[PDB]
Every structure is written in C-alpha cells, then in structure tokens.
C-alpha cells in the first residue's frame, strides 16, 4: 500500500528466522534500534508488528525516532522510544511503471502533525485558506495527497523503496516469538555438558531402557536429580550419569624407607584414568 494508509500486520504462533532475513541481497537497509541486529534471534518477544509501505528512496532516511520532515510529520511517525528493525529495499523493478506510477500517494499538507504510530484514513479536501473553502478544490484548497510518480529512468534515489518497519511489543505474558535456537549433534558414552530444551547439566549420556510417557520430557530420581532426558529431536530417552569423580590417595612406605609410592583412585574403573582394580 502507499504510505498514506500503511498496513499494520501482526505475526504470531511461529518463529522468526532473522538470520537469513538479514543476509539478504535485496535489503539495502536493515537498521535496528535498541537491539543487536544479529543477536535478536536469541531475544524472545511476544507480538511483532509490521508497518509496510512504499516510499521514495530519499525519504527512507525519515523513518527514525526524533526526526522531522515530511514522512515523519504527516504520514508515519516512529516513537522516540522505538525498538525494532526498519527494513528498506529498492523495488524499482516492479513498482515503477513506464510513464510514471500514480498509484502511490502521500500526504503533503495537513492541519497538524502526527503522534507516533498513527494512520489517517480520512482524506477530505484540505482547507488552509483563511476563507471558508466550502468544499472546493483550487487555490489555498489543494488536495492533501500527492503522487510519487516513479519512473525507471528517475534518479538513483528517487526510485520506489519498499519499507517494512518491525516493532516488537511485549504484553503481560512471557515472550512467545523467538529465533531459530539451533542444536548440535548428539554424542553418547563420553561425558559432555548439555542443554536439553533448557535443562542444563554435565554428564555421560547413554541409551536408557526405561520407558517414559509421551507428554513428560525428563525424569528425576529420589532427591530431585535428573537421571534421564528426552531428546527433543528424535524423542528417545537418554540416561544421565556424572562422569567419574573421586579421591586420589597416595600409599607411601615412609620416606625413611623409600620414596616409591602407589596411587589409589577411588571408585574409578580406571581403564579410563602395574594397574589393579
């Protein structure tokens, strides 16, 4: 749509993959305010609002907090405390029409400026002229909307730019929209430090013959210690065992007798540390 009436999209019940969204050739501008443009995936947010439209290439500058101008004052105003990414890419290839595109309109004049995140559906004929304009179009009574008029021949920064402004809003609920949260391959029989779906620990993982119920993920034994975890991907149950810890004890016949010693590693089947079990 044109900027004078910008659609206000809401995305929910899914996961936003902003990594591949960033490293996209077309998107010339990916400016994020208040957040790290790359690291936003680890960040989790509740509702995302998309403010999409088409503007002129020289007006993409005006989408920022605390900026004055035409687009900011009359069409679309970001708040001073705006947090989110403004994404802008040239669409001269599809939106410009030979001979000029008159289907993209913007508000040129208005009685008052705009408060942040506001849309002006009404487009009744403007009246600035101190004489009562009485619903007439003419001098001092010009139509508020003016057309961009894109041509593929126009300047390098006059071409249309499709801009979508994502604002991230948190409600009185925990964040529900997150990023990819990538995983790693699974290793058994060697003790590793692990993060299974938010459960963090360190141990050797093995196949477990115990059978869980479909809904339940992990298991505690007595004294509230995790002993089995369900793999989120393959849905198989893995037993957890802390890898060998123990005490070393030094067996000495006395420095008066000799300096030769034996070492006892306690409770360690030490095909892992003459050797005697």
């Amino acid at each position: 749509a044109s900027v004078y009436a910008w659609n206000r999209k809401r995305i929910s019940n899914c996961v936003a993959d902003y990594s591949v969204l960033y490293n996209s050739a077309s998107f010339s501008t990916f400016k994020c305010y208040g957040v790290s443009p790359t690291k936003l995936n680890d960040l989790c947010f509740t509702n995302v609002y998309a403010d999409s439209f088409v503007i002129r290439g020289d007006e993409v500058r005006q989408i920022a907090p605390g900026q004055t101008g035409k687009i900011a004052d009359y069409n679309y105003k970001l708040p001073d405390d705006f947090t989110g990414c403004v994404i802008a890419w040239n669409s001269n290839n599809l939106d410009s029409k030979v001979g000029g595109n008159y289907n993209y309109l913007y508000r040129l004049f208005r009685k008052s400026n705009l408060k942040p995140f506001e849309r002006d559906i009404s487009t009744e004929i403007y009246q600035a002229g101190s004489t009562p304009c009485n619903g007439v179009e003419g001098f001092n009574c010009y139509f508020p909307l003016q057309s961009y008029g894109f041509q593929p021949t126009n300047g390098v920064g006059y071409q249309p730019y499709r801009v979508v402004v994502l604002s991230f809003e948190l409600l009185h609920a925990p964040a529900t929209v997150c990023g990819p949260k990538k995983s790693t391959n699974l290793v058994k029989n060697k003790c590793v430090n692990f993060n299974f779906n938010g459960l963090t620990g360190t141990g050797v993982l093995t196949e477990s013959n115990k059978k869980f119920l479909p809904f339940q993920q992990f298991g505690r034994d007595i004294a509230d210690t995790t002993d089995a975890v369900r793999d989120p991907q393959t849905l198989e149950i893995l037993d957890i065992t802390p890898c060998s810890f123990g005490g070393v004890s030094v067996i000495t016949p006395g420095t008066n007798t000799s300096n030769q010693v034996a070492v006892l590693y306690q409770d360690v089947n030490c095909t892992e540390v003459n050797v005697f079990q």
Partner: nanobody
Amino acid sequence: QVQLVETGGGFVQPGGSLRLSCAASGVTLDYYAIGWFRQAPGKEREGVSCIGSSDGRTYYSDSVKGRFTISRDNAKNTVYLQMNSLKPEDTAVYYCALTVGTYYSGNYHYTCSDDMDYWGKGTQVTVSS
C-alpha cells in the same frame, strides 16, 4: 532531463497586455501540473494560476481577478497565459514549474505548493506609469 523557456516579460506602461509562454521539452511525466508563481523584490514568491495536463483545468488566485487565462497548447508543448489590465502592484517575476499529478478516486487531482518538483527561471514584468 527537462528544459523550460519562459518568454513574455518586459517593462511597459500600465494598460498593455502580455502573454507568457513556458515551453517544455523532454518531459517524461504523463500527467503534470504547470503553474505560474510571482516574485517581487521585497515580496515573497507566491503562485497566481495553474493548469492541468490531464484535462486542461485551471486554478485562479486573487491576482487573476478573472483576467488571467491559461491555455496550454500541445501543438508546441508550451503553456500560454494572457494578462489583461495589468496593475502596478503586479510588477513581479513569473515562474513556471512542473509538478507530478495526483491520481485518487479514479480522477486526476492537481496540487500546487510552495515547493515545485521542477523549477525554471521566469521573466520579470514591469508596469511603470
């Protein structure tokens, strides 16, 4: 890539009639608004009359007084404005400009502001008694 020529300016005693021409060549806009803006020393530039490319409709200001008439000709791609009963207070420099037209509600609406998308150097007219 547009060039404009404005002619019809000069100094003359009050009572004479003048015609202003603003030739346009190399214009790529299918629909555009052309208007005349007057500027005088000690005075601020302001528009007086405008014309439309879609249907030839015209807009008149207080300076027109029902006297100024604009008839764009596609024969020469030049806008001609006629002036009758010039007043001494009307001594100013007339400028012609090109503005991109607006399409809304299936109709071509033309808007003129203080700033024009395109601009050209007009001519100064002096009406001295």
